[PDB]
């Protein structure tokens, strides 16, 4: 039952080194082949390279000479470093466990066979933006509910997250307590080049005066955590 969680800088300056970390929980690192995959907006999933259970690594000739993949048993985590990055390197980076399969079309002796690799388990991935520009924390403003009345005991209540770079921002309500009515919208990229988004939950009208609603905003790159309370 391996669970994979990625971690990254969020922003990398051009010509600097990109480093991401995959946190493995509930299974030993040693038991699996491990690999890294990146996806870029204008490009398809790209295979960076893989590392065996024996610590043997094979890299993509395209990314060869810029990449290192390493394993840390003590922290039970995997690593991926990318030297001398450029905007071509802006992508979402995934780590995944890998399985090796052998298909023999002939006789194993005489080497009439070939290996193939496929990835059963994937991490959520981490977003990395390569830019000259500095990271900017977002400013959080509450979106007050109308108050009564709509003839249905629902009102729209949210938080506005403004002018942050780069992506992404994670928003939760009541410390993950309330999930039912929440809708967090995709961000918008402004002329400035900063991003903004909003998270909105639908709640009863009657509760609004006495109920507690707090939006928890996480921006790891900035790295900014802001909790803002919303009131009518």
């Amino acid at each position: 039952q391996v669970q994979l969680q990625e971690s990254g800088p969020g922003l990398v300056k051009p010509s600097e080194t990109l480093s991401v970390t995959c946190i493995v929980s509930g299974g030993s690192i040693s038991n699996y082949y491990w690999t890294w995959i990146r996806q870029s907006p204008g490009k398809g999933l790209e295979w960076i390279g893989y590392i065996s259970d024996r610590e043997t690594t094979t890299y993509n000739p395209s990314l060869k000479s810029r990449v290192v993949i390493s394993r840390d048993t003590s922290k039970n985590q995997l690593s991926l470093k990318l030297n001398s990055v450029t905007a071509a390197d802006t992508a979402i980076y995934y780590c995944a466990t890998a399985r090796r399969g052998q298909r023999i079309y002939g006789v194993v002796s005489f080497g009439e066979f070939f290996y193939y690799y496929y990835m059963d388990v994937w991490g959520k991935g981490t977003a990395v933006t390569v830019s000259s520009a500095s990271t900017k924390g977002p400013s959080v403003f509450p979106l007050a509910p109308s108050s009564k009345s709509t003839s249905g005991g629902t009102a729209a209540l949210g938080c506005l997250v403004k002018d942050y770079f780069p992506e992404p921002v994670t928003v939760s309500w009541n410390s993950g307590a309330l999930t039912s009515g929440v809708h967090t919208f995709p961000a918008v990229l402004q002329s400035s080049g900063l991003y903004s988004l909003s998270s909105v939950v639908t709640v009863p009208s009657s509760s609004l005066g006495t109920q507690t609603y707090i939006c928890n905003v996480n921006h790891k790159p900035s790295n900014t955590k802001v909790d803002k309370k919303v009131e009518p």
Partner: protein, 211 residues
Amino acid sequence: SYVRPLSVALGETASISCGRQALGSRAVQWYQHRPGQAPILLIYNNQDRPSGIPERFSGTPDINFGTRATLTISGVEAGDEADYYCHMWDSRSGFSWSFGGATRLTVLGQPKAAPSVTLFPPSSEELQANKATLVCLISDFYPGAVTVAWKADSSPVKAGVETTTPSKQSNNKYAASSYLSLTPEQWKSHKSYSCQVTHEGSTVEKTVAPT
């Protein structure tokens, strides 16, 4: 481009073919990726199917001399929209570092849904900052093409307006948002501001006013 679009009507069975056919013995893997989320392994070893993967997805085994590699989805749903990658390993090509081309599956015939629109005026905290932004939230609509227009009073505003391209939600309906950036004095300068969104010939218009 890396993308091959393919459109299929709802409830129909999709047929997807890997970009390059094998020369010999083969081991084909199918990956389903929705941009923004993690890829998933639909099929491995030609026909083998991981647990938690529905029966609807199937692959062609390469029995006998040969078989063409195709992915079949029976009774396609809206949630099956996504990019499909065929990972092909054969005995005459060697290590395949490329996942190859992506087949973008678009599902059609989904019923029309009117958008729900919510408009938020500038908050008191923002005004204190000498910034004003109006937030218009559009959700639960199909198809994904919407026209958003902002008015100050009865007159249109095109300045300081930022709108996202609509994208699919978890429920398979589209969501989008528009932002009108105003100085606080400008916000106070008008009796009202309106968010006019037009979807499939009809219009849903919301209005806020300085209080």
